[PDB]
């Protein structure tokens, strides 16, 4: 798309070799030397290194701690730049950013990439359709979607079935599980009583790193209590 397309990342075990290709489309990457500066999750940007432009001798230098396992290069012919990661470790998990510098013609901010370093395989989330068994709000119906036991934190798209006016769905940031490096998070929905009165059983859609959507069904709670007579 219209971004600094980085490929060859994603989940990867520690000690492996990861090859990153910061690709460009729509602008001249030759005139803007690509700089790679990684950032920890929620932390600031931490310098790594870069390779200069073709006219700038393609100088390659590496960070002191990271030196010895970087093969930083680029290919202006295919509008792409190379970042090579070797001997992966848990500290290497970061929000990696290839960026374009040294150019006034191109300074579009790249989206970067997410690299998580852990030998655990990606785990499909355990989608639990929690229902408001207790009393509902006076004018609204609240229905929540809960997912747990999913290892990779890269995009988790939780979307509901149908919404309109008066609906404000709230989703929470990922929370890492203390065991197995998994993650657990919930999703909240607000539903007007009129929509649920006619029916409109809501279904929860969740998206994983590569797993398809799990379309669990949540019957919206307006069931009239069965007036069962006690034995006489």
């Amino acid at each position: 798309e219209v971004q600094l397309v980085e490929s060859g990342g994603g989940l990867v075990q520690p000690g492996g070799s990861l090859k990153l290709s910061c690709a460009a489309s729509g602008f001249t990457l030759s005139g803007s030397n690509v700089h790679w500066v990684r950032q920890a999750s929620g932390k600031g940007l931490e310098w790594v290194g870069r390779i200069k432009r073709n006219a700038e001798s393609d100088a390659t230098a590496y960070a002191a701690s990271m030196r010895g396992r970087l093969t930083i290069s680029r290919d202006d012919s295919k509008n792409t730049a190379f970042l090579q990661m070797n001997s992966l470790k848990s500290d290497d998990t970061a929000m990696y950013y290839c960026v374009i510098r040294g150019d006034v013609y191109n300074r579009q901010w790249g989206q970067g990439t997410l690299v998580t370093v852990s030998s655990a395989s990606p785990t499909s989330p355990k989608v639990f359709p929690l229902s408001l068994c207790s009393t509902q709000p006076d004018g609204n119906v609240v229905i929540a979607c809960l997912v747990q036991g999913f290892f990779p934190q890269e995009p988790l798209s939780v979307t509901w079935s149908e919404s309109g006016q008066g609906v404000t769905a709230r989703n929470f940031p990922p929370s890492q599980d203390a065991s197995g490096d998994l993650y657990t998070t919930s999703s909240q929905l607000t539903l007007p009583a009129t929509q649920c009165l006619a029916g409109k059983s809501v279904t929860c859609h969740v998206k994983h790193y590569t797993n398809p959507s799990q379309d669990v069904t949540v019957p919206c709670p307006v069931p009239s209590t069965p007036p069962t007579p006690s034995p006489s």
Binding site: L45, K126, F128, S134, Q148, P173
Partner: protein, 219 residues
Amino acid sequence: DIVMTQSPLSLSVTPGEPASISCRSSQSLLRRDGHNDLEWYLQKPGQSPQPLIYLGSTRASGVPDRFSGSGSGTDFTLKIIRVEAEDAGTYYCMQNKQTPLTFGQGTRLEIKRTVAAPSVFIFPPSDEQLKSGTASVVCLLNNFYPREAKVQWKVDNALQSGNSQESVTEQDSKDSTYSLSSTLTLSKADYEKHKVYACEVTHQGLSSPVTKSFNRGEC
């Protein structure tokens, strides 16, 4: 090489208030194109900080008067003429010519809103998770300004720690009020040991903590 530093680190500012930040230079300001090395930045939710003023002495086109790029030479000057509810974030000054990209210490901005009382929407754990040997009690807090709050997972009025924690969203786009959610993680062996499960959240907006309890076997 050209070290960029920032003195302020975090601050709460109401909208329409002037805020000023200065970044200094430790080496030459020369760039690939010869302009000043500094490039201003502002953190935005759901993404990385975005550039504000690059080339140092040149104000970037399309940047409003709020952010001032009049800094030139070793010293620089950036202002925030008016604050917006969507301007919350951390501010970076950094050099972009040579190899060691040196970012500023960063000044996180939080928007000063009125204290609000969050609502409580508890959810009993699903029986499907109980079949997995684990449990999850969901205690929901919504649209409250003071993010600073403590959550106690008192299982049969006994607080447990190290397994159950909290999850708080960031400032909302509509009203810049945080929302809190906590989940009680208990094994099936511990689940059957305990009957009543309670969620306690101590919040400044809350006059007293609001707790909802579920008896084991409700679902």
